[PDB]
Amino acid sequence: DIKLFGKWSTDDVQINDISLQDYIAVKEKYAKYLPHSAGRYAAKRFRKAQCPIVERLTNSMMMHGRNNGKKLMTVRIVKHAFEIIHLLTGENPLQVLVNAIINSGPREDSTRIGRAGTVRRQAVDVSPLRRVNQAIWLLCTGAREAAFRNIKTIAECLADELINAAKGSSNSYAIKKKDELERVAKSNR
Template sequence: MVIIRQPVYLPHSAGRYAQKRFRKAQCPIIERLTNALMMNGRNNGKKIMAVRIVAHAFEIVHIMTDQNPIQIAVDAIVNCGPREDSTRIGSAGTVRRQAVDVSPLRRVNQAIALLTIGAREAAFRNIKSVAECLAEELINAAKGSSNSYAIKKKDELERVAKSNR
């Protein structure tokens, strides 16, 4: 059951969705994207910086595509979530990998993580800002283009899972 909450203006709920186990599923998707950008020691806790990056990336997406950037982000998350993964099944020292289906919540979590990791890696040692790289990553992922880091990783995960069926 999904509860529709009031629309929010700022993706800043002060950890209200982290109090119970599955409550993060009700957290606005853009806030989840913002929180995922606050990774690596030097960026921990810098929420205002992450909000600024996402806002700037959305402006770039709107200019480049003339579409609603939130819709582009949702399409990117839908396209980047792996449908199948492999897990380790092991007993008595022998370990083999078994293909398993991915739950909807984990698909969203992995898609957001892959998008932000791709943007961060593209911006590292590059003249482009993180916002520009995030915008590019979102647009490529929404199209399903293999130029996107997230799409490449998703395809790789599904290929490995297929070989372990």
């Protein structure tokens, strides 16, 4: 009975990725009314995995200078586009967001050469936490530059971005970037 905003439950959300189950916090101790909790999750390493995923998205929305610190605006932008994901798909918006997080996180990518090197790149595996972080960052960036210089409002660009990422469609900026990174890692194997 701790539905988000006041409408979205969490009891039905299934992560079903095993790898990211411990790093997406949505279900029972992480069911909160609002994606705004002050919180001190940056004080110690790995704690941000205890932060609810909706609050992580909300924090990632405050970007590009003019929107720094405006968290009430971002919680409004999440409340909308949850109201819109529900209308477009008919599913729980939390489930759509979780599926988007699963689909948009890279599994491999390239670093500078192995132990050492200054010429090419070497493929490596991605931590689950870095997977979730990169997924949130890519989803937010795709929404941000879909809404820029366009009559389409934010909370519409973000809703469609999350829906496409949940579907796995290539109309999503996050899915395109994930595929690009994974392919480059493949080439540098």
